[PDB]
Every structure is written in structure tokens, then in C-alpha cells.
Scaffold this motif. Structure first.
Motif, PDB file in Angstrom:
ATOM      1  N   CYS A 172       8.074   2.578   1.487  1.00 55.50           N
ATOM      2  CA  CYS A 172       8.501   3.859   0.938  1.00 55.50           C
ATOM      3  C   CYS A 172       9.039   4.797   2.011  1.00 55.50           C
ATOM      4  O   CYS A 172       9.814   5.705   1.689  1.00 55.50           O
ATOM      5  CB  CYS A 172       7.341   4.512   0.184  1.00 55.50           C
ATOM      6  SG  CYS A 172       5.978   5.080   1.219  1.00 55.50           S
TER       7      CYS A 172
ATOM      8  N   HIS B 139       1.199   3.378   3.134  1.00 57.71           N
ATOM      9  CA  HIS B 139       0.315   4.105   2.247  1.00 57.71           C
ATOM     10  C   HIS B 139      -0.974   3.310   2.051  1.00 57.71           C
ATOM     11  O   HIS B 139      -0.935   2.080   1.940  1.00 57.71           O
ATOM     12  CB  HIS B 139       0.996   4.350   0.900  1.00 57.71           C
ATOM     13  CG  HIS B 139       1.806   5.609   0.852  1.00 57.71           C
ATOM     14  ND1 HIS B 139       2.989   5.706   0.154  1.00 57.71           N
ATOM     15  CD2 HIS B 139       1.597   6.824   1.411  1.00 57.71           C
ATOM     16  CE1 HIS B 139       3.473   6.929   0.282  1.00 57.71           C
ATOM     17  NE2 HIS B 139       2.650   7.626   1.043  1.00 57.71           N
TER      18      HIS B 139
ATOM     19  N   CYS C 205       0.900   3.055  -3.878  1.00 64.08           N
ATOM     20  CA  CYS C 205       2.337   2.947  -3.636  1.00 64.08           C
ATOM     21  C   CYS C 205       2.750   1.485  -3.740  1.00 64.08           C
ATOM     22  O   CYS C 205       2.364   0.661  -2.904  1.00 64.08           O
ATOM     23  CB  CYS C 205       2.689   3.525  -2.270  1.00 64.08           C
ATOM     24  SG  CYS C 205       4.324   3.067  -1.619  1.00 64.08           S
TER      25      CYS C 205
ATOM     26  N   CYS D 119       4.442   0.115  -0.457  1.00 63.81           N
ATOM     27  CA  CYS D 119       3.589  -0.122   0.699  1.00 63.81           C
ATOM     28  C   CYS D 119       2.584  -1.231   0.423  1.00 63.81           C
ATOM     29  O   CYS D 119       2.269  -2.028   1.315  1.00 63.81           O
ATOM     30  CB  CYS D 119       2.871   1.169   1.084  1.00 63.81           C
ATOM     31  SG  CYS D 119       3.944   2.397   1.851  1.00 63.81           S
TER      32      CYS D 119
HETATM   33 ZN    ZN Z   1       4.303   4.014   0.380  1.00 62.32          ZN
END
Ligand code: ZN
Ligand code: AM2
Length: 258
Positions: A190, A242, A248, A251
């Protein structure tokens, strides 16, 4: 509203008062949405950037297509829309050299082809990438209405720290007349936690801040970005990921890839 359209001469001063020095290498990531209005539009920004660097300077900007199933040509392939108008316009102006691979950069200046002459770099931001040649040439990085989530040299620091996560990504080129898919393993996610570098660079007084047009501008030396992220990645290689608590999807995929 009725906002001040910045003229070229003031933009130059804004760039000089920010830390841009003549004769150097300056890699810029821009969001023209935050710069506007300018008296001469996006060209006015590009004209000031090269006017502040002087003739001996070299302006570098991202110039990749973002498409994974379409081959790339430096003469026609449009920049991905997430890079903005300034990116998509810069590579079409006279004497602006451009890389010949999907993850291309665009450069103009005496050191232009010193930066964009490499073939297809795998991963896209490896050593022998345009972003790595900016690092090798002690260039500056100008964040122009964008955060460190767009800081491409931060991804160069990841591979320089031999980060464990490698997610399968692909592109395509034209080998002897036909397509072929080129599969590689990239270190992308991300990129939201790239904003952590803001405090890292600021606490060491490595990041210059100020206005360029209407946009908030961040100016950091490329070697200072790599060095700072290296020590931080040397503390925790998963610090840009993350946590699973945040949920996420991007991630979490990088995490599962060891
Ligand atoms: Zn992320
Ligand atoms: C379609 N090509 C890519 C896509 O790969 C795709 O892979 C699969 C097949 O290939 C698809 N099924 C899947 O939909 C998709 O995930 O993943 C994203 C990941 C995102 N961090 C960003 O990357 C960054 C780049 O990794 C970075 O090198 C560059 N600086 C700019 C981008 N922000 O844009 C790419 C781009 O959208």
C-alpha cells in the motif's frame, strides 16, 4: 477561488528558497492539483524547474506506463494517470530523454542518459534503475504536493536492505516481434507507511520544506533518503508493512510472502 497564479520568476525563487541548487540532479514527483493555479500551467512548473537547475542541471521525473499487459515505447506510451499531468507532459518536450522499458523515467540535462540508459530493470526500482542512478549521482528528490507514499527512492532502499517480502508481479515487452510476459517478484504494498520517513528525515534535519506554487513541497537528498530508511529497515524490515491488525489486503499479501 481567486488564488494567485504564480509566475515563472517567483516559482524559481520558491524553488531556490526550498533548497534546489543549480547544476544538480533533481528527481521530482508532483501532484499538479496542489500546485495550480500557475500562470503558464503545468509547462510553467517544468520551465521553472529547469530554470532553477540551470543549463548544467538535469531534471528527472517518473514516466512509467503502469500497464502490465501492454508493451512500452518511449515515443507514444502515456504515463500512468497516477503520476499527474506534469509527468505525462515532461517526456514529450524537446530533448527529453526517456527510458525504453515499462518502468521508464524521463530526464533532461547533461546527465540525462547517465540516468535512463539502462535496459529493463527487474525489480523496477533495483540497482541500475533510473532511481538508483539518481542515488548514485547524489541527486535531490523533490516531493511536490505529494507525500512519501510517492517517494520512489524509498523502494530502492527496501531492496538495498534485502527486504524479505517479494510479491509476484509482471510486465510485457516485445521480443523479436512477439509479446512475452516477464514475471518477477516486486516489493510493493500500500506504501501508506512510507509517510513514516517524514518524522525520520525531519528529526535529523534532512528534509527541507516550503511552498512551490500552492503545493506543499518536500526536498530531500537521495542519499539521505536511502541512508535514513536503511537504518530504520535495519531495525525492522517489516516497518513499511501494515500490521495484520490493520487488515490491509496489500500488506498482508507481502507479509505472507516471507
Ligand atoms: Zn498496507
Ligand atoms: C496492474 N499492475 C500493477 C498491479 O499488479 C497487478 O498484478 C496482477 C497481475 O499482474 C493483477 N491481477 C492485480 O490486479 C494487480 O495487483 O499491482 C499494483 C500495486 C500498487 N502498489 C502499484 O504498484 C506501484 C508499483 O509497484 C511501483 O513500482 C510504481 N512506483 C507505482 C505503483 N504505485 O500499482 C500496481 C499496478 O496496478
Amino acid at each position: 477561488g481567486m488564488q494567485y497564479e504564480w509566475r515563472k520568476a517567483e516559482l524559481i525563487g520558491q524553488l531556490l528558497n526550498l533548497g534546489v541548487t543549480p547544476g544538480g540532479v533533481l528527481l521530482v514527483h508532483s501532484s499538479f492539483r496542489s500546485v495550480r493555479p500557475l500562470e503558464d500551467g503545468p509547462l510553467g512548473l517544468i520551465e521553472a524547474l529547469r530554470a532553477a537547475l540551470g543549463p548544467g542541471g538535469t531534471l528527472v521525473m517518473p514516466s512509467w506506463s503502469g500497464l502490465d499487459d501492454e508493451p512500452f515505447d518511449p515515443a507514444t506510451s502515456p504515463v500512468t494517470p497516477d503520476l499527474g499531468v506534469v509527468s505525462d507532459t515532461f517526456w514529450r518536450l524537446p530533448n527529453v530523454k526517456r527510458s525504453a522499458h515499462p518502468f521508464a523515467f524521463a530526464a533532461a540535462g547533461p546527465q540525462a542518459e547517465q540516468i535512463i540508459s539502462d535496459p529493463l530493470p527487474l525489480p523496477p526500482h533495483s540497482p541500475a534503475s533510473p532511481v538508483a542512478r539518481v542515488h548514485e549521482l547524489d541527486g535531490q528528490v523533490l516531493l511536490l504536493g505529494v507525500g512519501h507514499d510517492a517517494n520512489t527512492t524509498l523502494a530502492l532502499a527496501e531492496l538495498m536492505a534485502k527486504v524479505p517480502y517479494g510479491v509476484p508481479r509482471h510486465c510485457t515487452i516485445l521480443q523479436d516481434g512477439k509479446l512475452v510476459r516477464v514475471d518477477y517478484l516486486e516489493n510493493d504494498h500500500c506504501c501508506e507507511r512510507f509517510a513514516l520517513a517524514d518524522r525520520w528525515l525531519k528529526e535529523k534535519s534532512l528534509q527541507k520544506e516550503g511552498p512551490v506554487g500552492h503545493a506543499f513541497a518536500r526536498l530531500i537528498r537521495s542519499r539521505d533518503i536511502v541512508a535514513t530508511a536503511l537504518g530504520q529497515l535495519g531495525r525492522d524490515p517489516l516497518i513499511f508493512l501494515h500490521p495484520p491488525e490493520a487488515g490491509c489486503e496489500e500488506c498482508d499479501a507481502a507479509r505472507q510472502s516471507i
